[PDB]
From a paper:
A major factor that limits the expansion of shrimp cultures is, however, infectious diseases from viruses, such as P. vannamei nodavirus (PvNV) and M. rosenbergii nodavirus (MrNV), which have inflicted heavy economic losses. The Nodaviridae genome comprises two single-stranded positive-sense RNA that encode the capsid protein for viral capsid assembly, the RNA polymerase for RNA replication, and the B2 protein for host RNA interference suppressor. While the shell domains (S-domains) of PvNV and MrNV contain conserved sequences of 62% identity, the protrusion domains (P-domains) and N-arms show low sequence identities of only 17% and 43%, respectively. In this work, we have determined the cryo-EM structures of T = 3 and T = 1 PvNV-LPs at atomic resolution, the crystal structures of the P-domains of PvNV and MrNV (PvNVPd and MrNVPd), and the crystal structure of the S-domain of PvNV (ΔN-ARM-PvNVSd) in the T = 1 subviral particle (SVP).
The PvNVPd forms dimers in two crystal forms with the asymmetric unit containing one dimer (space group P21) and two dimers (P212121). The PvNVPd structure (P21) were first determined using Se-Met-derivatized crystals with single-wavelength anomalous diffraction (SAD). All structures of the PvNVPd were refined to resolutions 1.17–1.22 Å. The structures of PvNVPd from two crystal forms are similar with a root mean square deviation (RMSD) < 0.3 Å; and residues 250–368 were resolved in both structures. The structural fold of the PvNVPd consists of eight β-strands, differing from that of any other known viral capsid protein. The P-domain monomer folds into the core jelly-roll topology, forming a β-sandwich face-to-face with two pairs of antiparallel β-sheet. Four highly exposed turn insertions β1/β2, β3/β4, β5/β6, and β7/β8 appear on the top regions of the PvNVPd and might play an important role in the determination of the antigenicity. The semi-flexible N-terminal linker (residues 250–255) located beneath the P-domain must be disordered as there is absence of electron density. In the dimeric structures of PvNVPd and MrNVPd, the domain–domain contacts at the interface are 2-fold symmetrically formed with a hydrogen-bond network between the main chains of the antiparallel β-strands, β3 and β6. Notably, the sequence of the interaction region (Gln273–Asp278) of MrNVPd is distinct from that of PvNVPd, and two types (P21 and P212121) of PVNVPd structures do not exhibit the X-shaped conformation.
Residue numbers in the entry:
A (entry chain A): 7 to 118
B (entry chain B): 6 to 119
The structure:
């Protein structure tokens, strides 16, 4: 089968254009996961500016892009990452404008 | 043990507002379960008035994909679990609230692999 093992929100980095590390824990050791973006009922115009998030694995493939530009809107990409022996993996997450404090996230999918 | 995107598929563009149509997805492995997740790339949902709102549900399966581009309440969420028939197909029910929103959205078909 394929299932969503965990649904997590993206972090909200403090400084525009400066990525921060997001660590996901508690997963199965040395296991391949696929991450896909998702978000629910968000107001991306609740304050000035454009919500633009990029996420990449420190060790893996792919990029998630969430760009809510009203002219050119993208919610796409997927990440392949394998946990270490502890059941953890790290992403690098950046917001182009850090005052966009909407909540977005991803699904963590495994075959089991 | 591993997982991959088997294929990326665009959602249909229903012709009539509010009237669900079937989208038949083909070419997969017989009698096999997949997960579907939403995605879209570089769309201008404001090329004309009105809101792009799509909902998709398998005819036989679990979950609903929702893509609601309302600027006050924007959703790109849900995931569908669906099993193919013995010929490698499955059907979705897809409904667009305003059919004149001809933007392109879609889903990833996620599969187990080695």
């Amino acid at each position: 089968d394929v299932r969503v093992d965990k649904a997590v929100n993206f972090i909200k980095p403090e400084v525009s254009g400066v990525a921060e590390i997001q660590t996901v824990t508690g997963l199965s050791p040395s296991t391949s996961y696929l991450l896909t973006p998702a978000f629910l009922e968000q107001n991306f115009q609740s304050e000035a500016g454009i919500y633009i998030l990029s996420a990449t694995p420190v060790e893996g493939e792919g990029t998630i892009s969430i760009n809510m530009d009203p002219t050119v809107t993208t919610v796409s990409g997927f990440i392949k990452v394998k946990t270490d022996t502890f059941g953890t993996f790290d992403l690098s997450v950046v917001l182009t404008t850090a005052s966009k404090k909407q909540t977005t996230g991803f699904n963590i999918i495994a075959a089991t």
